[PDB]
Design a protein around this ligand. Sequence first.
Ligand SMILES: [Ca+2]
Length: 142
Amino acid sequence: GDIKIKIVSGTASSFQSGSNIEKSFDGDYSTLYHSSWSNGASNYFPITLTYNFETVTDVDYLIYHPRNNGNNGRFKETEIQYSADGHTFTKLIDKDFQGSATAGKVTFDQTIQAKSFRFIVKSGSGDGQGFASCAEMEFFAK
Ligand SMILES: [Ca+2]
């Protein structure tokens, strides 16, 4: 009986219209958040994604679900951060999601009290210099 925390809102520093961040918290593994398809800029990365809860909440682990079809945007090198108030962020861990096509679970060394989590995606798979995309992002408490 692990509680899946309710994500109420989010932001993305890059998105393609119709694939904004909320498509990664709609409960549907086929619908994607996807960064802008125009990925030629030198400062395109990093791509920063923020997921917000309604209130500060206990969280023990998260699962990033990448797209299973297509290779554009599977996360690679990320910095994961959390915020107790939604404004000030603290580094939690550098996580290499490896460009993997399968879900990546990150389990914390303690229960984290957070109103928000943030992913600074430094690299991601795909055409050109790559993209960032996410089928679902999930947060859980034991
Ligand atoms: Ca989705």
